[PDB]
Design an enzyme around this catalytic site. Structure first.
Site, short mmCIF file in Angstrom:
data_model
loop_
_atom_site.label_atom_id
_atom_site.label_comp_id
_atom_site.label_asym_id
_atom_site.label_seq_id
_atom_site.Cartn_x
_atom_site.Cartn_y
_atom_site.Cartn_z
N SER A 172 73.95 21.21 46.72
CA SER A 172 73.22 22.11 46.04
C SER A 172 73.92 23.69 46.32
O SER A 172 75.32 23.51 45.94
CB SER A 172 71.71 22.26 46.24
OG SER A 172 70.75 22.57 45.68
N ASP A 407 69.73 15.93 36.56
CA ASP A 407 69.41 16.69 37.51
C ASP A 407 68.73 17.85 37.04
O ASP A 407 69.21 18.56 36.17
CB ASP A 407 70.50 17.28 38.41
CG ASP A 407 70.55 17.59 39.65
OD1 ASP A 407 69.42 18.53 39.88
OD2 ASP A 407 71.16 17.15 40.45
N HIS A 434 67.65 15.67 41.92
CA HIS A 434 68.51 16.35 42.54
C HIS A 434 69.32 15.82 43.49
O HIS A 434 68.57 15.30 44.72
CB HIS A 434 67.85 17.64 42.84
CG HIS A 434 68.80 18.86 43.20
ND1 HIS A 434 70.08 18.96 42.92
CD2 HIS A 434 68.69 19.94 44.04
CE1 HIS A 434 70.74 19.96 43.30
NE2 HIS A 434 70.00 20.40 43.98
C1 LIG Z 1 69.84 23.34 46.56
O1 LIG Z 1 70.68 24.15 47.17
C2 LIG Z 1 68.80 22.61 47.05
O2 LIG Z 1 68.54 21.60 46.47
O3 LIG Z 1 68.49 22.97 48.31
C3 LIG Z 1 67.22 22.54 48.76
C4 LIG Z 1 69.42 24.23 45.30
C5 LIG Z 1 70.65 24.94 44.63
C6 LIG Z 1 70.00 25.81 43.49
C7 LIG Z 1 69.33 26.91 43.45
C8 LIG Z 1 69.56 24.43 42.56
N1 LIG Z 1 68.14 25.02 45.85
C9 LIG Z 1 66.83 24.74 45.32
O4 LIG Z 1 66.75 23.91 44.34
C10 LIG Z 1 65.65 25.62 45.74
C11 LIG Z 1 64.76 24.83 46.67
C12 LIG Z 1 64.83 25.24 48.05
C13 LIG Z 1 63.62 24.84 48.90
C14 LIG Z 1 63.57 24.75 50.49
N2 LIG Z 1 62.69 26.01 50.71
N3 LIG Z 1 65.23 25.99 44.84
C15 LIG Z 1 65.31 27.20 43.75
O5 LIG Z 1 66.32 27.78 44.02
C16 LIG Z 1 64.23 27.57 42.79
C17 LIG Z 1 64.11 26.38 41.99
C18 LIG Z 1 63.37 26.62 40.60
C19 LIG Z 1 64.16 26.86 39.39
C20 LIG Z 1 63.23 26.97 38.34
C21 LIG Z 1 62.07 26.96 38.27
C22 LIG Z 1 61.43 26.92 39.44
C23 LIG Z 1 61.99 26.54 40.65
N4 LIG Z 1 64.67 28.63 41.81
C24 LIG Z 1 63.60 29.58 41.68
O6 LIG Z 1 63.47 30.76 42.81
O7 LIG Z 1 64.15 30.43 40.53
#
Ligand SMILES: *[C@](O)(C(=O)OC)[C@H](CC(C)C)NC(=O)[C@H](CCCCN)NC(=O)[C@H](Cc1ccccc1)NC(O)O
Length: 464
Positions: A172, A407, A434
């Site tokens: 990610s 994903d 994911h």
């Molecule tokens: C990836 O690094 C991962 O899966 O790590 C857990 C991923 C990288 C990109 C941003 C996809 N990060 C995430 O998925 C992250 C989860 C971390 C949780 C741990 N405390 N989530 C987000 O970045 C948010 C996901 C999202 C997207 C659209 C709507 C709701 C939620 N992004 C929001 O902050 O915009």
């Protein structure tokens, strides 16, 4: 030099790394990087380095979940090594803006009202929030926490390991890290695999809408399964699902004052805010492992209870049994804001709102106001350290990008263009999760180990 010490879960080593905050100013102040080394069990090529991304995810953390699901033969030929990046939990100094009260207080709200006053309130709290950081963190530090500096650290890490070239696996956000170092030390790269890809060239707004559709697609696919299952709490009609969904989630909000949360009963003293009702959903959409958890918490809301959905939100937030959070929430934001320039224009956020509501109606509450609040990073005081651009890393070893077809987080097309931008080999997984590597799937891990030890990329357009 790295003095390795025991710690407490395997055959694991622990250390810390001195890195400078500013690499322009390498004489002032120093970070100490949390480290964990899992020795190989046979003839070794070197250390494989993983990162769960996030940003905010503790590399110490992931590296234990990974340990259990680590191929027999990979273990043999590699030091699996994980690390907290600069500011992550054990990694000192750690980032702290919000307190626990700060977080719970925020999540107690439904966050749906985009009236001018409702938009006025959010960004006021965005504002007071940013001051906490700099109050407790020093603006100087926050500039240099961009992945740009993280890459330089990752280089110092490899050196600390006695590896001459790097072996890497990034999840990610970890892939945005991978690309950084890739553009940075293409020669210091033995092999590399990126899972759940992140595209630096992309426009930051289009991206978020890709993610919107990505989650609604996932939602479509969950409800399609559940509706085949017995007693789907969204009904057996997958069409009308989002509706039923809203029929279950909208009453967590007083339909006559959008600032008033009417939370679902839980054994936990908190009940369930609308905000958290949604957060737990996103949570379970990340992997199909969590879909029964979903079916639970819904049937809860059906009966007016929210205990399951309440746990999913916590798992997303990493808020422990005792109510302590780890800093991953704070960390996420700090890095995002340096990594690329925020969306200053108001109009374009308001329009993104307008669109996203249509793109992902299950997430969007009630009516489009005409207004949306600017992102948090649009308030950021330290400037973006890094720039959205196509990746230019020419003489790089063939690597493996991996993206899952459905994903929701990092959409499949992200892996596509990144691979193109790397001229590397791509690995496709048919699924609505994911990531997927080392998560019980024999086929992927074959190719992965092949590329890993053997250095052998999957064929043109390999699909497992
Ligand atoms: C990836 O690094 C991962 O899966 O790590 C857990 C991923 C990288 C990109 C941003 C996809 N990060 C995430 O998925 C992250 C989860 C971390 C949780 C741990 N405390 N989530 C987000 O970045 C948010 C996901 C999202 C997207 C659209 C709507 C709701 C939620 N992004 C929001 O902050 O915009």
């Amino acid at each position: 030099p790295v003095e390795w010490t025991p710690c407490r879960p395997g055959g694991a080593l622990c250390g810390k790394l001195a890195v400078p905050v500013d690499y322009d100013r390498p004489d002032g102040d120093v970070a100490a990087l949390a480290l964990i080394r899992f020795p190989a069990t046979g003839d070794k090529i070197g250390s494989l380095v993983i990162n769960p991304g996030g940003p905010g995810e503790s590399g110490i953390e992931a590296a234990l979940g990974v340990f259990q699901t680590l191929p027999k033969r990979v273990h043999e030929r590699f030091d699996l090594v994980g690390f907290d990046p600069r500011g992550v939990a054990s990694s000192r100094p750690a980032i702290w803006c919000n307190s626990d009260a700060d977080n719970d207080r925020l999540r107690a709200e439904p966050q749906v009202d985009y009236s001018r006053e409702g938009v006025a309130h959010i960004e006021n709290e965005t504002k007071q929030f940013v001051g906490r950081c700099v109050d407790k963190m020093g603006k100087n530090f926050l500039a240099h926490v961009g992945t740009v500096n993280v890459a330089k650290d990752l280089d110092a890490i490899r050196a600390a390991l006695g590896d001459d070239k790097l072996t890497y696996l990034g999840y990610s956000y970890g892939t945005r890290i991978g690309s950084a170092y890739a553009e940075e030390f293409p020669q210091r790269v033995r092999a590399m695999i990126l899972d759940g890809a992140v595209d630096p060239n992309a426009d930051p707004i289009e991206a978020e809408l890709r993610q919107a559709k990505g989650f609604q697609d996932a939602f479509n696919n969950y409800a399609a399964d559940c509706a085949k299952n017995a007693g789907c709490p969204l009904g057996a009609d997958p069409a009308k699902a989002v509706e039923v969904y809203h029929s279950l989630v909208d009453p967590l909000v007083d339909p006559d004052n959008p600032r008033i949360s009417r939370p679902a009963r839980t054994k936990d003293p908190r009940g369930l805010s609308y905000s958290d009702a949604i957060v737990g959903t996103i949570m379970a959409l990340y992997s199909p492992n969590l879909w029964q958890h979903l079916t639970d918490g819904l049937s809860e809301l059906v009966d007016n209870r929210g205990d399951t959905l309440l746990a999913l939100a916590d798992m997303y937030m990493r808020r422990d049994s005792h109510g302590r959070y780890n800093n991953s929430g704070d960390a996420r934001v700090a890095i995002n804001c340096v990594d690329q320039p925020p969306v200053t224009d108001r109009d374009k956020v308001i329009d993104e709102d307008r669109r996203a509501r249509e793109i992902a109606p299950f997430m969007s509450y009630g009516k489009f106001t005409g207004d949306a609040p600017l992102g948090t990073c649009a308030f950021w005081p330290v400037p973006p350290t890094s720039q959205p651009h196509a990746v230019s890393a020419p003489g790089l070893v063939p690597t493996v990008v991996v993206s899952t077809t459905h994903d929701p987080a990092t959409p499949y097309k992200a892996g596509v263009d990144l691979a193109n931008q790397l001229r590397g080999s791509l690995l496709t997984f048919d699924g609505t999760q994911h990531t997927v590597v080392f998560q019980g799937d024999s086929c992927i891990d074959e190719y992965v180990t092949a590329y890993l030890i053997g250095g052998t990329t999957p064929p043109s357009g390999a699909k497992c």
